[PDB]
Amino acid sequence: PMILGYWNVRGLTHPIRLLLEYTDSSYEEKRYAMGDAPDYDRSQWLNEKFKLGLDFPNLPYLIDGSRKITQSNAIMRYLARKHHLCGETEEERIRADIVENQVMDNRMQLIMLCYNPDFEKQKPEFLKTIPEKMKLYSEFLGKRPWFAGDKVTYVDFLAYDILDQYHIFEPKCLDAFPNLKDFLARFEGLKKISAYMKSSRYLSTPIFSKLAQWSNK
Amino acid sequence: PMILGYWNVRGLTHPIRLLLEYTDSSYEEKRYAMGDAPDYDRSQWLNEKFKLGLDFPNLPYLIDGSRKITQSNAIMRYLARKHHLCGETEEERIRADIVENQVMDNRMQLIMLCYNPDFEKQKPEFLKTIPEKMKLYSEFLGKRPWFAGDKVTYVDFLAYDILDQYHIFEPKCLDAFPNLKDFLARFEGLKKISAYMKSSRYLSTPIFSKLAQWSNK
Numbered sequence A, B: 001p002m003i004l005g006y007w008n009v010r011g012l013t014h015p016i017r018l019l020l021e022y023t024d025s026s027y028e029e030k031r032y033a034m035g036d037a038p039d040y041d042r043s044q045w046l047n048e049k050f051k052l053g054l055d056f057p058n059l060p061y062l063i064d065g066s067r068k069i070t071q072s073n074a075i076m077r078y079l080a081r082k083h084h085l086c087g088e089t090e091e092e093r094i095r096a097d098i099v100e101n102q103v104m105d106n107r108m109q110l111i112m113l114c115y116n117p118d119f120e121k122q123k124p125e126f127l128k129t130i131p132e133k134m135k136l137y138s139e140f141l142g143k144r145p146w147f148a149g150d151k152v153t154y155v156d157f158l159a160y161d162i163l164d165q166y167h168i169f170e171p172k173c174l175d176a177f178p179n180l181k182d183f184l185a186r187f188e189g190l191k192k193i194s195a196y197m198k199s200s201r202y203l204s205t206p207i208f209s210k211l212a213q214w215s216n217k
Ligand SMILES: N[C@@H](CCC(=O)N[C@@H](CS[C@@H]1c2ccccc2-c2ccccc2[C@H]1O)C(=O)NCC(=O)O)C(=O)O
Pocket: A007, A009, A011, A012, A049, A057, A058, A059, A060, A070, A071, A072, A073, A107, A108, A111, A207, A208, A209, B101, B105
């Protein structure tokens, strides 16, 4: 089978785990565990980081036959090309490219805040920027069923994950944007997705490592 | 013409400027200035941020008629598809995808240090990590003339840029890596590039905004 390697946290790997399920991929995962404070040992990974034949050793990684990939985005794209989940027109391609990169931006923002020792000080302020962020996604999506247009593409798995994370962070953030709540429901309603969510493999939380100030357990 | 907007710094926009030049594109630039400390005024940009019809307003931006794009990597991809500078086979696509994202990781590491108020004390630690980073690029490229294979692709524009930035930061960092010095020369050796470098338009440094601790003026 294919092998997915990552920490035993949702982190930035949710989209790949969902896409493996949606495509009915034959895969097994290696979920590395980090140690407890003060040490937070990374040994389980570190011992084999440079023994896997990866070009640029990192987590997550994907092993698919003789192909070895790192970089979450490159893993998504690889799987999208494999299963025909890319945009079919220039218009869809552009939408997907922008979405993929914007998600990473909004992700880094949450991460950077969640790892700040001053998290509690900062929250209030970060919370005030949510509406403006969500608004942008809502207006982009509009009346379309999916982010790139008429069909589900790999970017919907990226956007699902980030909107879901923001929603966990702030329960009421999507209340003013019905199309986004609708989108979450539509994504969760995809048959393989609905099944996966009830399974033992589903890892919703924690999102972050032991080290973060939020969703660390 | 196409309009490229960004700060009046190199930042993360070098690859686009190089690419517009390499493909002989007709384009004008809007180089926004930032005020000096302590306020670091951003009004030139902010005065029009929400007035350009961008889906997710940001810098850089590229306006190509009706087409309005943000996210640096989506701009590279759009220009790459227009001019057939994408990988042609699966193998080249995967190499491109990984390098694109890896470059961003190595760019973000540099930014994190350069914006750290503990810059001078932090620097030593940073320097120790460079040899490893360069080694991975060196081993990945190997004996290939270009990053994706035997033809220049958009990713060579990204790789050029991050390799050059690190080389400016630590001038002895490529000495141990023959094929990386060769690559820089090959790339700078391209007619259109060589020509641009002599042009009024060329903007090598500052790399960072006025707020940084290095290459800030
Ligand atoms: N840009 C690369 C991310 C590479 C990276 O930072 N990987 C981290 C895990 S993601 C990491 C993370 C860790 C734990 C919990 C959460 C996260 C996470 C979540 C969201 C966004 C980013 C992260 C990273 O901090 C790592 O541990 N790499 C192996 C190594 O360096 O030796 C990619 O998109 O795949």
